[PDB]
Amino acid sequence: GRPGESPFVKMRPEDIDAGGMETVFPWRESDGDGTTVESEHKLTEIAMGVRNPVMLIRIKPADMHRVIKRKGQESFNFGELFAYTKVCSHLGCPSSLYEQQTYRILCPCHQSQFDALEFAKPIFGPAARALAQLPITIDEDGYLVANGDFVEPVGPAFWERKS
Amino acid sequence: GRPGESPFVKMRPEDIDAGGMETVFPWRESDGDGTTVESEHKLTEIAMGVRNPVMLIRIKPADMHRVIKRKGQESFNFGELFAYTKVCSHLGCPSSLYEQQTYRILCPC
Amino acid sequence: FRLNCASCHNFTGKGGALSSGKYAPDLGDANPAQIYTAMLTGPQNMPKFSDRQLTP
Amino acid sequence: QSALLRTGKQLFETSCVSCHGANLQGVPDRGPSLIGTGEAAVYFQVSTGRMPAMRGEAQAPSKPPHFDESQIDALGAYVQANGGGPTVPRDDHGAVAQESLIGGDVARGGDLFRLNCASCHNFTGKGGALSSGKYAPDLGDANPAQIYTAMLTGPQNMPKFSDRQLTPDEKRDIVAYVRESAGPAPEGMAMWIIGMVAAIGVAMWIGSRA
Amino acid sequence: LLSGTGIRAALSGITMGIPVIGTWMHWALFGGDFPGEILIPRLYALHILLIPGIILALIGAHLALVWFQKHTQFPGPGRTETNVVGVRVMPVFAVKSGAFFAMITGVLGLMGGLLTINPIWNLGPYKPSQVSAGSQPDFYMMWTDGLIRLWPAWEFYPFGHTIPQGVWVAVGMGLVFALLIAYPFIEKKVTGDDAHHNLLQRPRDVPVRTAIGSMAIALYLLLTFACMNDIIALKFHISLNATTWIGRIGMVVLPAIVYFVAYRWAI
Amino acid sequence: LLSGTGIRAALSGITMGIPVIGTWMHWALFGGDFPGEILIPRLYALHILLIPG
Amino acid sequence: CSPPGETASSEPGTTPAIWTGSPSPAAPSGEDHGGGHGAGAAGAGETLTAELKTADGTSVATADFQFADGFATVTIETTTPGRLTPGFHGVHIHSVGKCEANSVAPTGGAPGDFNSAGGHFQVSGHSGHPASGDLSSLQVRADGSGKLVTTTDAFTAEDLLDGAKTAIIIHEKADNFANIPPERYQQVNGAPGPDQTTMATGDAGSRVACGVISAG
Amino acid sequence: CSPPGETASSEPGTTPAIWTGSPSPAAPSGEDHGGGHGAGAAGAGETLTAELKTADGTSVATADFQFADGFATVTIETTTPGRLTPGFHGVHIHSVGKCEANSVAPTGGAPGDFNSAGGHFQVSGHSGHPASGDLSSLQVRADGSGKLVTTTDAFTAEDLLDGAKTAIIIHEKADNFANIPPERYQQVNGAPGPDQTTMATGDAGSRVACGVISAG
């Protein structure tokens, strides 16, 4: 929350602990701290990206055995780390609410819950499509980095989708 | 006129030559180049200051003998360098139209 | 140009009137060498823009 | 370890010789003797929520820790070598154990909690209020080692439970309970009552029923 | 934060879910993706000049129609379909209308003072990554929001396409507005009465219409409280799923109950 | 540039000129010194809604 | 309807591999400069470090040598607090970069950290006086640290980028260079001249540290 | 009406004096500081330069050494293209910082640039082995330039600010330090040990360069 300077800081898996949720953003080395004028525009773009914010969830190791995985998203999780888009699959509000020991990602706009244990499929509310899962891993030095891109469009659905 | 970075750079008397005018601004060492975000707001303020811009004019040495000075402004000039506000004294438009060989600062407004 | 030239010529290089019988001619006819030399030397009532003031 | 005692003395000499002078000897009316308190008691303050407050007070805030995990270990080994007492539960690697301190029983991990300790806290694990200016803190922040160290090294006005009083096993079970356990709307209604009933009643006053 | 979240939900999602032209309407309105740099200027134009201008023109038409199509009146002693019994404009009606205007603006000023409305300072600046739990629109759009919440996540996927749940609520709003606009013609087609009516009829004297209006008001209240189910669940201790499903079941049960009760009550 | 210098001359200069209330009128209209950051929004309102109305 | 693609219970998956980001192509071709230097050879740049280790495999010193504006702006820091004893370790530049525990390039005794192919690694065209191969005494006190520099630029980055990697070797002697002149002092054989072995490079007892300057 | 204040025919004026701005009291709460270092003394900081001149006033070289993180990083740039001949030079730290052309602290011949109050400017508590009083050597090729570093940290920024300013004095010898061991070589009098004057500091002919390290 630092006002303006170094708003986005690299992250490591150890930072989260079991039953922890952290909102992360797609930061590039080129998108350095906000000190420069060239930066603080790339960083503002990152912050204002509608489809940018993601929620990184540390699934409790005890409950790791209840996890079901989607087609083509089986290796997306890094150990017990699951990165799901915050944007709700129905009308695109962030699904920022997270319930641990229930593993339910709740959206405040229209009360839709997604089962984080399984692929983040909606188990209540208006949402009908699962939240897109970001592939994640650790680069050299252990910092968390996306292992690719979402295998599906991430925002709310529209006519030209599912193909 | 560099677009954004180092818009204001320090100045030296030798840069101007007799019968030359240059628009200068009040730059501070603290108001460094526009690379940072703290800077480029100080620099924008300097640029957008209504009363900030000044014209530095080099009076020719031959014509230096025609200069008549104001009370309390006799020592203001540095040799043959005279710094006058660009803002016209009447309604505040810049008076940028400097005519040498007549030494007349004309306002276009 | 706007900071220095438009002062008397125009926004877009047209001419402008000066104190008494003088004027700034329209630049449309000047070729690049003539424009550069017009800056380099102050012909009459145009400030002389040295290379130090306006580097090449 | 030779380095752990050495680092501990340097960090001790720069924080608590003001209240525990020299080799863990308490300053009278400023702080207690630290002889016999041991690593886990040191774990229960700087490592745990209740780091000691420089202003004297009935209770302290679990203020943000002033020492890092290697430092908390160095400070602790200094007081366990100087004093001799309880040691913080540690895993096979040598880190302070947290998951291992998660007890298998939560049912009995709970029953233990209610007879022993539930009362000063809350059955939920929410705080309770206690003696003079003393409160029992919410145990939501506490990691499992923190939980085991409040019980083994009784902090302040918190009954001390020895490994004999509550076995090492039950303390884990206790951790399992006290961790497993851990505009438009008002504005529109205010319109429809205050403003709209006012307007409608005013109209009924001005107008005529018929 | 609050109002931008509301915009992101309704204006963006609903618009972009519409099958044939949804994304095109979204991009035309926002000048691009959702956070397009022209949304608020466009809404400012629409809200200070365009829509208020149309509202002023339609209010002028409304008042002129009421003025020259003399106001209807309830049946009474001397009141017939070919006369207006009341008070003349100058002495009494004008003074009481002006006084009522004074009192209404006094109520509004008192509420503006004593009751806090929309503390935007509390509601931080809009950021797509941030959100609250309330996330409601004003009470007049609360029924649309409640429809969004209650409708049961029915999505259709034609050949290589998606038909999100937003279209359901969009069509629902379209139907609501069409029915509201076309009711008098619907009522005249159904009943058969095209007679020039100048005497009102008491709601009790028309059991079917008062029953239908009570049913519609019940549905509107159900939707409005469904939009508030979050705070209702929070304060009045009722599970959020329970509130959602209470709304879902009621929006077909409560209208029927209220219709029957209102019909019998009128009779 | 043209419209801005025209504004600077007419509005700002002639407003500050007025003897007893000139500077006060200037500060009320521009919300401060001449380049005050509310001038163009205020003119936009006056020009699309108020004066056209 | 339900989304066409869901519910793949099978294929449990695998742990993602460690990400190895590719360098930014011509698109984001911008990258940090690795150091400007004359580089009169295949290219070394203005960045070059090295670790002078001991016979036990432990780092003793850490040197850094690199051209900045045509001259090597170097710096050396002791990697341990007790590497050098309370005295002056004599530094030198050996042509052979192999910082082995003990080696002998010629046919003879293999001194500890004596992998140098001679004495001081002078320039290609210079083999007389103590050229850039030679170095003076750097002192480590009871604290046991080393950090101090001089101006020894008989060679440059081009000369350092020679056929064989060079090394910095610190023995246990000072820098005198026959301080006893022939006027008064005499040698073993009675000649007042100095010793060639002592004049070519700093000769001392067993080498204390040695580190290859090939970006070690 | 004309404005009240205009026109001044008399009092021709004066040329404005050279501006001497003052440090900001308002913008800066305190005084801005440059190099950061422990500086266990009255205060020297992480910035210390020096200019080693010649007997005729010519700049022999320009050294600069400063503490950064407990280890002093140093570097010397040649002041002239031919300050040093095509050979070697020995640099030593002298306790006396006076970089005079010729001086003699003791009662004896005054050697060129011999203002040092003894040999190597060792630490206060160290006077035996060649402590930090000895600096790295300077090897000059036909190019005649100086740039190289060693690890000499027996003294630090705290010890640099001693009772008297120190200096770096470069004579024109190599770095040997009695490289002829007593086993083979012998002294003038037949003893196999080395010379005390040679062991104390790098002894050579007339000093070539000398520069005070008191932020010269």
Ligand SMILES: CC(C)=CCC/C(C)=C/CC/C(C)=C/CC/C(C)=C/CC/C(C)=C/CC/C(C)=C/CC/C(C)=C/CC/C(C)=C/CC/C(C)=C/CC1=C(C)C(=O)c2ccccc2C1=O
């Ligand atoms: C979509 C939908 C309707 C889902 C169902 C959830 C729901 C609304 C359930 C009913 C809520 C209630 C009445 C809870 C109390 C427990 C309960 C159910 C008791 C039995 C109900 C029953 C049949 C009782 C018999 C007698 C009877 C009719 C009692 C009614 C009692 C009440 C609460 C009457 C008022 C109704 C009411 C205001 C309900 C809450 C609705 C809203 C939107 C309140 C808005 C509001 C809120 C939420 C504030 O926090 C607030 C804070 C500060 C100032 C103002 C306000 C404010 O106006």
Ligand SMILES: CC(C)=CCC/C(C)=C\CC/C(C)=C/CC/C(C)=C/CC/C(C)=C/CC/C(C)=C/CC/C(C)=C/CC/C(C)=C/CC/C(C)=C\CC1=C(C)C(=O)c2ccccc2C1=O
């Ligand atoms: C910090 C700060 C800025 C604070 C201020 C807040 C702000 C920005 C704005 C509010 C400030 C103001 C100016 C508030 C007062 C607003 C105002 C004009 C109130 C007037 C009420 C008043 C003072 C009454 C005094 C009592 C009295 C003697 C009344 C009789 C004389 C009067 C005033 C008669 C007025 C008659 C009246 C309301 C005319 C309205 C004109 C219009 C638009 C339509 C006329 C009209 C009407 C009214 C119908 O009802 C109607 C019904 C059916 C068909 C047609 C019509 C029709 O044409």
Ligand SMILES: CCCCCCCC/C=C\CCCCCCCC(=O)OC[C@H](COP(=O)(O)OCCN)OC(=O)CCCCCCCCCCCCCCC
């Ligand atoms: C919140 C609640 C939802 C919102 C509610 C508002 C919408 C309008 C409300 C109700 C509409 C349905 C009314 C009931 C319609 C009656 C049907 C019938 O059987 O026709 C008998 C009639 C009497 O004729 P009669 O000589 O008196 O003979 C006595 C015989 N026993 O015939 C006719 O003239 C008319 C025949 C055709 C009528 C067609 C009306 C609907 C037009 C389409 C608009 C959409 C409708 C949406 C419905 C919700």
Ligand code: HEC
């Ligand atoms: C009054 C201030 C003044 C400013 C400042 C000034 N000009 Fe001019 N310009 C003049 C005047 C007066 C002349 C007429 C010179 C002459 O006729 O000899 C002129 C002549 C010229 C001409 C000759 C055109 C022709 O066809 O003969 C060119 C080209 C020109 N200016 C370009 C420039 C450029 C480029 C600058 C860049 C800052 C500049 N001016 C700035 C006033 C000005």
Ligand code: HEC
């Ligand atoms: C006033 C400043 C103050 C500082 C700073 C302080 N303490 Fe304390 N300490 C106290 C007071 C008062 C208590 C009594 C409260 C209690 O018993 O928990 C206490 C309690 C303790 C206890 C529990 C004794 C027991 O058995 O009840 C331990 C262990 C302890 N301190 C160690 C430390 C260590 C280790 C540090 C710092 C590295 C430290 N303290 C810093 C004042 C301080």
Ligand code: HEC
């Ligand atoms: C009065 C009886 C009492 C009993 C019995 C008791 N506590 Fe406490 N506890 C306290 C008081 C008072 C404090 C405040 C002292 C302190 O925090 O230093 C406290 C401190 C704590 C803290 C401090 C860390 C934090 O969260 O801020 C934790 C955790 C804790 N107790 C949990 C337990 C657990 C778990 C048990 C038994 C399984 C237990 N307590 C037994 C009253 C009690």
Ligand code: FES
């Ligand atoms: S916006 Fe997320 S469920 Fe509707």
Ligand code: FES
């Ligand atoms: S604006 Fe009038 S003379 Fe300048």
